[PDB]
Design an enzyme around this catalytic site. Structure first.
Site, PDB file in Angstrom:
ATOM      1  N   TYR A 170      -1.588  -1.076  10.552  1.00  0.00           N
ATOM      2  CA  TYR A 170      -1.613  -1.303   9.118  1.00  0.00           C
ATOM      3  C   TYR A 170      -0.332  -0.770   8.491  1.00  0.00           C
ATOM      4  O   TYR A 170       0.347  -1.485   7.753  1.00  0.00           O
ATOM      5  CB  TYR A 170      -2.833  -0.642   8.493  1.00  0.00           C
ATOM      6  CG  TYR A 170      -2.948  -0.846   7.004  1.00  0.00           C
ATOM      7  CD1 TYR A 170      -2.377   0.064   6.109  1.00  0.00           C
ATOM      8  CD2 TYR A 170      -3.655  -1.926   6.485  1.00  0.00           C
ATOM      9  CE1 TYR A 170      -2.513  -0.096   4.739  1.00  0.00           C
ATOM     10  CE2 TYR A 170      -3.800  -2.097   5.114  1.00  0.00           C
ATOM     11  CZ  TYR A 170      -3.227  -1.174   4.248  1.00  0.00           C
ATOM     12  OH  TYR A 170      -3.398  -1.320   2.895  1.00  0.00           O
ATOM     13  N   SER A 191       0.848  -1.181   0.000  1.00  0.00           N
ATOM     14  CA  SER A 191       0.000   0.000   0.000  1.00  0.00           C
ATOM     15  C   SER A 191       0.883   1.230   0.000  1.00  0.00           C
ATOM     16  O   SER A 191       2.078   1.150   0.315  1.00  0.00           O
ATOM     17  CB  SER A 191      -0.855   0.014   1.276  1.00  0.00           C
ATOM     18  OG  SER A 191      -1.413   1.287   1.528  1.00  0.00           O
TER      19      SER A 191
HETATM   20  N1  LIG Z   1      -8.731  -1.250  -1.375  1.00  0.00           N
HETATM   21  C1  LIG Z   1      -7.756  -0.350  -1.349  1.00  0.00           C
HETATM   22  O1  LIG Z   1      -8.012   0.829  -1.611  1.00  0.00           O
HETATM   23  C2  LIG Z   1      -6.354  -0.664  -1.020  1.00  0.00           C
HETATM   24  C3  LIG Z   1      -5.272   0.379  -0.998  1.00  0.00           C
HETATM   25  C4  LIG Z   1      -3.941  -0.150  -0.645  1.00  0.00           C
HETATM   26  C5  LIG Z   1      -3.671  -1.400  -0.368  1.00  0.00           C
HETATM   27  N2  LIG Z   1      -4.661  -2.417  -0.374  1.00  0.00           N
HETATM   28  C6  LIG Z   1      -4.234  -3.769  -0.054  1.00  0.00           C
HETATM   29  O2  LIG Z   1      -4.630  -4.610  -1.092  1.00  0.00           O
HETATM   30  C7  LIG Z   1      -5.001  -5.926  -0.587  1.00  0.00           C
HETATM   31  C8  LIG Z   1      -6.409  -6.071  -1.090  1.00  0.00           C
HETATM   32  O3  LIG Z   1      -7.223  -5.150  -0.357  1.00  0.00           O
HETATM   33  P1  LIG Z   1      -8.754  -5.065  -0.676  1.00  0.00           P
HETATM   34  O4  LIG Z   1      -9.148  -3.674  -0.822  1.00  0.00           O
HETATM   35  O5  LIG Z   1      -9.279  -5.943  -1.750  1.00  0.00           O
HETATM   36  O6  LIG Z   1      -9.311  -5.545   0.755  1.00  0.00           O
HETATM   37  P2  LIG Z   1     -10.251  -6.683   1.157  1.00  0.00           P
HETATM   38  O7  LIG Z   1     -10.407  -6.654   2.625  1.00  0.00           O
HETATM   39  O8  LIG Z   1     -11.537  -6.563   0.397  1.00  0.00           O
HETATM   40  O9  LIG Z   1      -9.441  -7.955   0.607  1.00  0.00           O
HETATM   41  C9  LIG Z   1      -8.687  -8.746   1.524  1.00  0.00           C
HETATM   42  C10 LIG Z   1      -9.321 -10.104   1.547  1.00  0.00           C
HETATM   43  O10 LIG Z   1      -8.529 -10.825   2.497  1.00  0.00           O
HETATM   44  C11 LIG Z   1      -9.382 -11.653   3.201  1.00  0.00           C
HETATM   45  N3  LIG Z   1      -8.710 -11.954   4.428  1.00  0.00           N
HETATM   46  C12 LIG Z   1      -8.483 -11.122   5.486  1.00  0.00           C
HETATM   47  N4  LIG Z   1      -7.831 -11.698   6.473  1.00  0.00           N
HETATM   48  C13 LIG Z   1      -7.627 -12.978   6.017  1.00  0.00           C
HETATM   49  C14 LIG Z   1      -6.990 -14.085   6.596  1.00  0.00           C
HETATM   50  N5  LIG Z   1      -6.421 -14.118   7.778  1.00  0.00           N
HETATM   51  N6  LIG Z   1      -6.953 -15.253   5.869  1.00  0.00           N
HETATM   52  C15 LIG Z   1      -7.539 -15.255   4.625  1.00  0.00           C
HETATM   53  N7  LIG Z   1      -8.154 -14.280   3.993  1.00  0.00           N
HETATM   54  C16 LIG Z   1      -8.167 -13.153   4.750  1.00  0.00           C
HETATM   55  C17 LIG Z   1     -10.648 -10.847   3.374  1.00  0.00           C
HETATM   56  O11 LIG Z   1     -11.826 -11.631   3.678  1.00  0.00           O
HETATM   57  C18 LIG Z   1     -10.760 -10.097   2.060  1.00  0.00           C
HETATM   58  O12 LIG Z   1     -11.603 -10.688   1.059  1.00  0.00           O
HETATM   59  C19 LIG Z   1      -4.774  -5.815   0.919  1.00  0.00           C
HETATM   60  O13 LIG Z   1      -3.471  -6.358   1.238  1.00  0.00           O
HETATM   61  C20 LIG Z   1      -4.875  -4.322   1.176  1.00  0.00           C
HETATM   62  O14 LIG Z   1      -4.231  -3.952   2.420  1.00  0.00           O
HETATM   63  C21 LIG Z   1      -5.998  -2.075  -0.695  1.00  0.00           C
END
Ligand SMILES: NC(=O)c1ccc[n+]([C@@H]2O[C@H](COP(=O)([O-])OP(=O)(O)OC[C@H]3O[C@@H](n4cnc5c(N)ncnc54)[C@H](O)[C@@H]3O)[C@@H](O)[C@H]2O)c1
Ligand SMILES: NC(=O)c1ccc[n+]([C@@H]2O[C@H](COP(=O)([O-])OP(=O)(O)OC[C@H]3O[C@@H](n4cnc5c(N)ncnc54)[C@H](O)[C@@H]3O)[C@@H](O)[C@H]2O)c1
Ligand SMILES: NC(=O)c1ccc[n+]([C@@H]2O[C@H](COP(=O)([O-])OP(=O)(O)OC[C@H]3O[C@@H](n4cnc5c(N)ncnc54)[C@H](O)[C@@H]3O)[C@@H](O)[C@H]2O)c1
Ligand SMILES: NC(=O)c1ccc[n+]([C@@H]2O[C@H](COP(=O)([O-])OP(=O)(O)OC[C@H]3O[C@@H](n4cnc5c(N)ncnc54)[C@H](O)[C@@H]3O)[C@@H](O)[C@H]2O)c1
Lengths: 261, 261, 261, 261
Positions: free
Chosen positions: B158, B145
């Site tokens: 985070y 991120s």
């Molecule tokens: N959405 C954004 O704007 C954004 C910005 C920067 C970084 N990210 C990073 O990108 C990745 C995807 O984020 P996202 O937005 O799709 O979030 P999200 O929460 O929708 O996706 C993460 C998925 O991980 C699953 N998960 C969480 N803990 C878990 C565990 N212990 N075991 C198995 N599955 C687990 C959740 O159920 C979820 O579907 C993450 O690493 C997030 O930190 C997202």
């Protein structure tokens, strides 16, 4: 590969040789209308143009010294005159020479800063000026180096030029991001090019540089042209103000491998 | 788009929704074999699986909690058992929750570090273990991120998890670059996903976020999956240990626009 | 040297040995009221306390394991109970052990992350909690390492812990800066301490590490205690969220000396 | 405060006003011998010189334009001629002016790069030349800015000059660390100086700037001179190649306060 690059006008400074040449050929292969550039030797551009013809591409060669404001202005205008527009500006021209800092002449320092940094500013300024005045979400790619981060003894002027290019690019990226104009840097590690041909032909020197590259090999120009092509495409739609390092791991501190220290 | 991706086995954690889902579909479109992952029930993964079928892709869904070692190990084994091998390991699962640092519980802190960092470690470890024991030039893409660089009050856990992920990735990349095993991070900015659906639903909060994005718009998942596809491809053959930010300029310090300060 | 440090209460975790010990002695010399810490060995604290007595300083030793929430809470409270206040919190406790990443057990990974990172979070959280609840512009100094930036093969857990500490510190610094609470990291390079005594006593290993230090020598604990003393003082009044590297140049990429590459 | 600074010869460019003036006085207070510098008339330097006399310090004022090689050389020679040696060289002279990048003239760009970067180079070069030819473990402190990291629209030249200065310094530090010659940068945030006196005079602009400073207040010159004194001292004996930021948190991304984004 990149469909949105079709018909896009791409200008590349110092593209008659090395990485610039590889980028002009790659863009031509992506069906982009390329504007190759040579400082004074129109003969060097011949080779790139023939390679571009070999892939059924379209391009012209324009003479222009990046340290000469009028040459840069004319280079951008030439693209618009010939192809009717400008989409991508790549400031790739550059030079270097090893001299111990306390022994480096002002002339040497200024030549490198002028070409590497000021040259990139002029090219960036002209491309962006056109993009702004005509509401075009064009892009600017500046050829940096791992040395915009890795210090370089004997090459203080080069390191400084690239460090300056980094901030220039980031500033330009933040400044013009509202208009959708992306500006990014490519940070190449050691890449087999003319400036390295003799040095890397020697097994001792080649092995030394290779020992400084975690992935174990000196890159090829194609590996950098691949980065430029991607950055220019809509695939990199949300990418701006970054430096994409293509260096086999150089920036990871090769001296620290195997847990040394 | 990337011919070399055809037939490659890609495992993606937490790929039932958001960025993970998008990448899974994008890799399906690249004709790669995909192993999708869900935490609790397989119902959650059926949307992704149907999307992959729609494009003619091959895939399976495998239950697994990334903080459970045996689950992570099983996830890698399942890919190898189902498709015969593993080429790309993407540690995408993640979580966050706002709490003022001085009031943050050890429990909250641990949940985030365990999933975001340790989870990424286990996945990288298992994939790399397989790559080394079989001398396969595989690759590991870790979803970081902008916050591996941009500090984030209310999300100290985070931010630390991603900062830790950055060093983990760089270390892994340096350690395994000699074996051609590339390890890179992707740093998304604000991307429209289910974790932001409600917050960005309020036009006042959406506008606040957009005002922090130089490019002026919240990204879409496809813009991130684009980065993942490229990084996995041979087009990024000389790229390792980097964090490729796709944030529309967030890391450029949005508060300094227009010469402020 | 630093007059404003007189009567300031300074807590230092893992201060019975190495850098922590040197910091406790330095702070005592600055007339600060120091609270030394030992995990279980109360005997190790004896030595630091005697050194503190030798300079006419005032200090107490408190038992506390940084991975145990109650121990950390008690450590901060002990400072307030004994001296009536808290001014500086230094999270210095740490550990490391070389293991190839793909062979590193979860147990090993968690132990290092727990002590180095989570331990620092707890200490930071407690100090800041007190600072906030009582309107005190105290400060928090986290003992990081050059490895919060330099990758470290065989030490992925350590590199990750420090990379995470970097973002934690920056986040804490941005979060509490409005209240005048400064939070900074010190980034030591190779420093002659117990954990290095045997390794550096061997001329071959000592010379190897020295070849990785541009300044040519392994630092002394005093050189790091000097950094902490300054950072805690009002001389660093406008300094927060930074990592002050005291490493003889390690972060400058020693492999690139003499213009190599 | 720093006993080792007594009798040391410190040369500071553009030290008739602002940060330069403050450092000159601070070094006078540290009982060091100072060589102040002014660009046009010696009248400008009399305020600093009287301040130094007031504290019982020894000093001279030497005319010199940092973009003129012979002037820079003379400045170093004058210190050596007047005090017999040179210990600390501080390249402080600087300038900036806002202009949208695409509208910035080559003339404007050059004036800033020449003074800020090339000027710093010449000073570092001459001081280091003296240090090497006499095997003196001198030090060079270069005055950068948060903008060697934080991009700055309207000041693309300033940002690039400082970004370039960062790499110059890192290179010089790596190149000369074997000789114990430390080279470090100081990165001030918003500091109340004559260049900001008018802008910060308007309470609306002062409030805008303060809102970008996490610590909530514009710094004072003394807070920077504090950093310069420490860096020059033996207290920072193991510190080289760094940029020590003193910005009240600017580099921490102020727009991300309170979990925004
Ligand atoms: N959405 C954004 O704007 C954004 C910005 C920067 C970084 N990210 C990073 O990108 C990745 C995807 O984020 P996202 O937005 O799709 O979030 P999200 O929460 O929708 O996706 C993460 C998925 O991980 C699953 N998960 C969480 N803990 C878990 C565990 N212990 N075991 C198995 N599955 C687990 C959740 O159920 C979820 O579907 C993450 O690493 C997030 O930190 C997202
Ligand atoms: N080759 C590498 O390994 C490597 C690594 C990092 C960065 N780079 C950067 O990539 C770019 C390409 O380098 P390269 O290896 O192909 O080197 P190169 O010397 O072969 O290419 C640079 C080109 O710039 C042209 N040029 C120089 N000064 C000019 C001027 N004033 N006006 C117009 N043209 C001018 C040269 O004639 C030359 O063809 C450079 O900016 C270089 O600093 C190269
Ligand atoms: N020595 C170096 O060269 C060097 C370089 C960079 C960073 N550092 C960092 O500086 C700090 C000091 O290192 P050092 O060289 O003095 O090492 P050290 O091992 O001598 O000191 C660390 C101290 O932490 C204590 N400790 C460990 N786990 C603990 C726990 N759970 N609870 C309480 N105390 C605990 C240990 O008993 C020990 O006395 C560490 O955080 C280290 O990572 C040291
Ligand atoms: N004031 C701030 O808030 C701030 C913030 C960050 C960085 N800085 C940096 O700190 C340094 C000091 O800045 P300052 O605020 O005191 O600014 P300043 O303009 O008041 O000080 C710079 C001095 O340099 C002199 N100078 C300029 N060009 C010169 C040349 N060619 N030859 C000789 N002298 C020359 C000027 O006359 C001036 O007195 C600069 O490098 C500046 O970029 C200042």
């Amino acid at each position: 590969m990149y469909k949105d690059l079709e018909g896009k006008v791409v200008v590349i400074t110092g593209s008659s040789t090395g990485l610039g040449k590889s980028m002009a050929i790659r863009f031509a292969t992506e069906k982009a209308k390329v504007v190759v550039n040579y400082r004074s030797k129109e003969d060097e551009a011949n080779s790139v143009l023939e390679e571009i013809k070999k892939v059924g591409g379209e391009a012209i060669a324009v003479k222009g010294d990046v340290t000469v404001e009028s040459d840069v202005i004319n280079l951008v205008q030439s693209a618009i005159k010939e192809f009717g527009k400008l989409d991508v500006m790549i400031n790739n021209a550059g030079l270097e020479n090893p001299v111990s800092s306390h022994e480096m002449s002002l002339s040497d320092w200024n030549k490198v800063i002028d070409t590497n940094l000021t040259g990139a500013f002029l090219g960036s300024r002209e491309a962006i000026k056109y993009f702004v005045e005509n509401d075009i979400k064009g892009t600017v790619i500046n050829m940096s180096s791992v040395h915009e981060k890795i210090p370089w003894p004997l090459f203080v002027h080069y390191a400084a030029s690239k460090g300056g290019m980094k901030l220039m690019t980031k500033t330009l990226a933040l400044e013009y991001a509202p208009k959708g104009i992306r500006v990014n840097n490519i940070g190449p590690g050691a890449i087999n090019t003319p400036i390295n041909a003799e040095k890397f032909a020697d097994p001792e020197q080649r092995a030394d540089v290779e020992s400084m590259i975690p992935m174990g090999y000196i890159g090829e120009p194609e590996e950098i042209a691949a980065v430029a092509a991607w950055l220019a495409s809509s695939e990199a739609s949300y990418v701006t103000g970054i430096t994409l390092f293509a260096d086999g791991g150089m920036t990871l501190y090769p001296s620290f491998q195997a847990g040394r220290g």
